[PDB]
Amino acid sequence: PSKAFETLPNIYLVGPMGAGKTTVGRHLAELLGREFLDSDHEIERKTGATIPWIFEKEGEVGFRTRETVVLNELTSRKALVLATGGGAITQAPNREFLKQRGIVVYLYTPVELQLQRTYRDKNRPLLQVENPEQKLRDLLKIRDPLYREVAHYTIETNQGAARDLAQKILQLILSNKLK
Ligand SMILES: O=C(O)C1=C[C@@H](O)[C@@H](O)[C@H](O)C1
């Protein structure tokens, strides 16, 4: 049906916790008639444990080693839209897999909106802290250049229909390519 887009590369969404990666990703996949996967959810599926449990029992290092293995595998698939984890771009091998194996889109999201969308979400181990706003801010200061460097496209998002943002991303990508 949208076999029309079968030769379009994988699309990889990057950005912080609360960027709407999975809601936008799933709409973008539906628009393209292809698969959608969330690497956070795939890590949980493959491990049989939640991400808080991985962080507690294996540390952040054990989460990163599991995440890199999953990303290596998922970026080798075809016809995918992938929502990546918020800290996936902290590791050099992941930056390379993403940049070199499809189209990377950075969902730039202000801290205010990250905060609202992760409000009392206990599944985000890094935000289980007294001051989650400062944490998000600190994380963004570090990771914003990394999101931008891996990204082919950056879209400065804001409160809205995830499906409107998915449309916009698809327009951006094709704008380039159809001329
Ligand atoms: O910002 C981060 O480093 C993380 C974001 C989440 O998507 C998970 O991938 C995990 O909680 C770590």
Amino acid, single-letter form, for residue 28:
L
Backbone angles phi, psi at 35, to 5 degrees: -75, 150
Atom of ligand 1 nearest to the CA of 87: 3
Q: How far is the CA of 146 from the centre of ligand 1 (A)?
A: 15
108, β-bridge pairs: 156
Q: How far is the CA of 178 from the centre of ligand 1 (A)?
A: 35
* CA-nearest residue, atom 5 of ligand 1: 86
For residue 179, give the DSSP letter: -
Q: How far is the CA of 163 from the centre of ligand 1 (A)?
A: 23
Q: In testing the pocket of ligand 1, which one of 12, 37, 39, 40 has its CB within 8 Å of the most ligand atoms? A: 40
For 23-62, letters b (16+ CB in 10 Å) and e give: bbbbbbbebbebebbbbbebbbeebebebeebbeeeeeee
CA distance 82 to 107: 13
CA distances from 1 to 29, 135, 138, 146 (A): 13, 44, 44, 36
Q: How far is the CA of 86 from the centre of ligand 1 (A)?
A: 4
Amino acid, single-letter form, for residue 81:
V
Residues whose beta carbon lies within 6 Å of some atom of ligand 1: 17, 40, 51, 85-87, 124-126
| CB 59 within 8 Å of CB 125 | no
CA trace torsion 87, 13, 26, 55 (10° rounding): -10
Atom of ligand 1 nearest to the CA of 43: 9
Q: Which residues have CB under 8 Å from 48's CB, separation 6+?
A: none
Antiparallel, parallel or unpaired: β 35-38 and 153-156: unpaired
Method: X-ray
Domain boundaries, given as residue ranges, for the chain: 1-179
Query: Which secondary-structure segment (H or E) carries 14?
Result: strand 11-14
For 99-126, letters b (16+ CB in 10 Å) and e give: bebbbbbbbbbbbebbbebbeeeeebbb
Resolution in A: 1.9
Q: How far is the CA of 160 from the centre of ligand 1 (A)?
A: 23
Q: How far is the CA of 90 from the centre of ligand 1 (A)?
A: 10
- The CATH superfamily holding the domain 1-179 is P-loop containing nucleotide triphosphate hydrolases (3.40.50.300)
